């Protein structure tokens, strides 16, 4: 069931990095956030969608370096 832990971790990682992105708005942060989210299991399809939407909204606001 380590898979359960792995998947939860990915989800945690993605959430943190997405939050981090909403904070800094940088290309570096965008990239980490986007890849992290890409790694979230389909099991979390809903929050994965919510997380992607959050990424899309930060980009809609514009990046700064």
């Amino acid at each position: 069931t380590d898979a359960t832990i792995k998947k939860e971790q990915k989800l945690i990682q993605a959430q943190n990095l997405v939050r981090e992105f909403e904070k800094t708005h940088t290309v570096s942060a965008h990239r980490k956030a986007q890849k992290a989210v890409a790694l979230v299991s389909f099991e979390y399809k809903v929050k994965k969608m919510v997380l992607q939407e959050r990424i899309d909204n930060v980009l809609k606001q514009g990046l700064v370096r």
């Binding site: 570096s28 986007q34 890409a38 299991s41 389909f42 990424i55 899309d56 514009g62």
Partner: protein, 297 residues
């Protein structure tokens, strides 16, 4: 580290993707790699931070359009009713894997393609076969040469699976074993290679799984001309592509002593990609230079 490649030299790489299953990837390639390179060398500020969002918009456009050619099996071809291409499906995996850092990419589209390649196109001996060559033979780079096709194609596909591993690990149980088998094949025939191209591409494949050493590494290193390039008598584009694969191998090995001359040679070629038949050379030279910028001390 050496100076980065001036962003101004890459403005022609932001392209609109169009055409069918192959052509869409030919257009998607330059844009994806240009953003990838500009991101790594942080040249957006001194170039146009707003142009990035535009490029990203074009990448999304390329991605969605590519999905129209995803067949029920998860494989790709120029047209949905055309027999699926091993090379193209592998290339789509290659490009989408690098683009995972730029836009939303459905893991099941990526891993579905991976699964298909393993289940349908890999022989029990590990080799990967192409049963329906792409129309645009000019987009496959050095793999156009007919000699050592089994090694070259197996290396190419293995590279794709390796670059997709992180993304597909948890959903493709057979991925680890497929990679092993592919590696075994490359290993048992590596010493017999005659083309600098195959040596380079297979070298990178083997280096990624820590199997490029002993006499194989010696072969790989000694194949280079003047210790700065991997070339064969043919199109110069193939050598640029080959040497780029070689740079990626050296970086994978952490052989930073052999790296400087190679990077210097690539820069001295002043090859900024784009144009008919530039697909592999464009993607590889910049993936390699970006990696160099990222890793090199």
């Amino acid at each position: 580290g050496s100076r980065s490649t001036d962003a101004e030299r890459l403005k022609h790489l932001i392209v609109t993707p169009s055409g069918a299953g192959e052509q869409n990837m030919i257009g998607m390639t330059p844009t994806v790699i240009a953003v990838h390179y500009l991101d790594e060398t942080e040249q957006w500020e001194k170039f146009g931070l707003e142009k990035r969002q535009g490029a990203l918009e074009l990448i999304k456009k390329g991605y969605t359009q590519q999905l129209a050619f995803r067949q029920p099996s998860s494989a790709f071809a120029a047209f949905v009713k055309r027999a699926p291409s091993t090379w193209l499906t592998a290339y789509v995996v290659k490009v989408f894997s690098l683009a995972v850092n730029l836009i939303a990419i459905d893991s099941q589209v990526l891993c579905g393609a991976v699964k298909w390649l393993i289940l349908e196109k890999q022989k029990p001996d590990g080799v990967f076969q192409e049963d329906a060559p792409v129309i645009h033979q000019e987009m496959i780079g050095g793999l156009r040469n007919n000699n050592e096709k089994d090694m070259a194609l197996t290396a190419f596909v293995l590279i794709s699976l390796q670059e997709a591993k992180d993304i597909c690990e948890e959903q493709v149980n057979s991925l680890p074993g497929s990679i092993t088998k592919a590696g075994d094949f490359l290993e048992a025939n590596y010493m017999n290679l005659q083309r600098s191209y195959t040596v380079a591409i297979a070298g990178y494949a083997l280096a990624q799984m820590g199997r490029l050493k002993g006499p194989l590494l010696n072969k790989f290193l000694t194949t280079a001309k003047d210790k700065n390039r991997w070339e064969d008598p043919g199109k110069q584009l193939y050598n640029v592509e080959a040497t780029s694969y070689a740079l990626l191998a050296l970086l994978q090995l952490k052989d930073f002593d052999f790296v400087p001359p190679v990077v210097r040679w690539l820069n001295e070629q002043r090859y900024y990609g784009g144009g008919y038949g530039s697909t592999q050379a464009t993607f590889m030279v910049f993936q390699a230079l970006a990696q160099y910028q990222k890793d090199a001390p």
